Amino acid sequence: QEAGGRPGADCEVCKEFLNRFYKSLIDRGVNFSLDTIEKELISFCLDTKGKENRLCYYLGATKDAATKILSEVTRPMSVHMPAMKICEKLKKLDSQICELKYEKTLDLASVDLRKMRVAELKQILHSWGEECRACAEKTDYVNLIQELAPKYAATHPKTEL
Description:
Elements: H1 13-26, H2 34-43, H3 51-58, H4 74-77, H5 87-90, H6 118-127, H7 138-152
PDB class: signaling protein
Keywords: signaling protein, parkinson
Assembly: monomeric
């Protein structure tokens, strides 16, 4: 069982996503195997983008990974190991799986991309560890930043709130 609507305590990335995922195994009558869960974890991550997507990648369940992840979530899931009892123990081993606050977007939603000055934009790109060896004006940066945004978007060190 699970509560259905519990608080995303401990790890909100490593909870809700995998918990929603587990349901999609159960509901659809999917065989819980290392093999089959790995595959579904890849495809289930198609709709997701952002924290979850980073998570997927850390779990090898992405197209940009060679998959093949064993005891790391996949194995316990294959032996009915509900999502709420995995990340809680994972924190004591690794926290990169949980501290995925580097969302699908930066607070570019909070800032106007046209009021800006190239310098600001440079801070943004530096915040996403990139280097524009080909860039010109702020408008150029904006155009570029907008497409690179969901790929990096290293959100400021705070919560969603």
